From a paper:
[name] and TFF3 are disulfide-linked homo-dimers with each monomer possessing a single trefoil domain, while TFF2 is a single-chain protein with two trefoil domains.
Eventually we obtained mTFF1 crystals, though they only yielded an apo structure. At pH 2.6, the Kd for mTFF1 increased only slightly to 67 ± 1 µM, while for mTFF3 the Kd was 350 ± 60 µM; six-fold higher than at pH 7.4. The structure also provides insights into how [name] might bind H. pylori in an α-glucosidase sensitive manner. The core oligosaccharide of many H. pylori strains bears a Glc-α-1,4-Gal-branch, while the N-acetyl group of GlcNAc-α-1,4-Gal bound to the TFFs is solvent exposed and makes no interactions with the peptide. Clearly, the Glc-α-1,4-Gal branch of H. pylori core glycans could be easily accommodated in the TFF binding site.
Author numbering: 1 to 49
The structure:
């Protein structure tokens, strides 16, 4: 792996859309988390090393 879903919520950039599902987020190669408010559910991953 070269990408990680460990992103600070205030740094998460929107990768999806209103009502995006994990499957639609996985199709785009992005990360999903709806347990944090005020941030996009589907966001881009962070680069490692």
């Amino acid at each position: 792996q070269t990408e990680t879903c460990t992103v600070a919520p205030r740094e998460r950039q929107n990768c999806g859309f209103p009502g995006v599902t994990p499957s639609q987020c996985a199709n785009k190669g992005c990360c999903f988390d709806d347990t944090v408010r005020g941030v996009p559910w589907c966001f881009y991953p962070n680069t490692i090393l």
